[PDB]
Design a protein around this ligand. Sequence first.
Ligand SMILES: Nc1nc2c(ncn2[C@@H]2O[C@H](COP(=O)(O)OP(=O)(O)NP(=O)(O)O)[C@@H](O)[C@H]2O)c(=O)[nH]1
Ligand SMILES: [Mg+2]
Length: 176
Amino acid sequence: LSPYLQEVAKRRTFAIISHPDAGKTTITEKVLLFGQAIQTAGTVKGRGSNQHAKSDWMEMEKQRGISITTSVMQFPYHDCLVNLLDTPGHEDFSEDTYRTLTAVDCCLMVIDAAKGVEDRTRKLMEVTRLRDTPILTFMNKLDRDIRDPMELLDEVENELKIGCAPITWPIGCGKL
RNA sequence: GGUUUAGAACGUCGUGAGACAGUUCGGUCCCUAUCUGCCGUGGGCGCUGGAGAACUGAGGGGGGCUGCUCCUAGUACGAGA
Ligand SMILES: Nc1nc2c(ncn2[C@@H]2O[C@H](COP(=O)(O)OP(=O)(O)NP(=O)(O)O)[C@@H](O)[C@H]2O)c(=O)[nH]1
Ligand SMILES: [Mg+2]
């Protein structure tokens, strides 16, 4: 427990991957307020939640349309020091994302519970198994009317060839 | 202020006086309301002995517009926007 091997062990550096518009960038902004980096928060395109607070999608064109290239982040949560990446969704667009995976020891996949598993979701798992990299799964968008979370588990096991272990479970979806 | 008076000029027409549904500058707009109506306000009598109060409510009138924001929710919808 020397001041060296202690700093090392308390660190944790990970990805965040998605099919385009799943919510990487949003869950990221929220992860940032659980780290006391953003005292308020925002949305995307600076949209529906007002205030010139978008944000932390670096660049510029990102804020005009929707997301471009990996923003990177370091903040403290609980007993750890997290290093957070923000991987772009789009076939032609990255690249980069792939090279970014080279910097992560593990990885979190966001899934649109209203959409299930999409195309670049499937392609991203292939790239993942290249390094036997671990995957956390987050089922985003429970504010929306979604599919049966049972069926959502099938699509994840069947099409992504990986076991599902529910930690939490939604009670009602959409307006409920 | 416009434009159908009287002054004056331009262009135009006519020998001319004058003329143009061409133009230009100037140029007196009265009424103390009797009736109807309408807004208000009293007087009289009626209502069945006379009086002071408080009512019922037939009916009449006034009022009746709308923006933006927030919650639902950036949810339904949408590939997105
Ligand atoms: N209803 C709802 N909408 C969400 C949720 N999370 C994200 N969104 C919406 O989904 C859209 C996609 O946002 P974004 O975070 O850019 O997704 P992304 O995965 O970063 N984009 P990309 O995959 O292109 O990099 C946003 O407009 C945001 O409003 C959620 O939990 N619920
Ligand atoms: Mg993004």
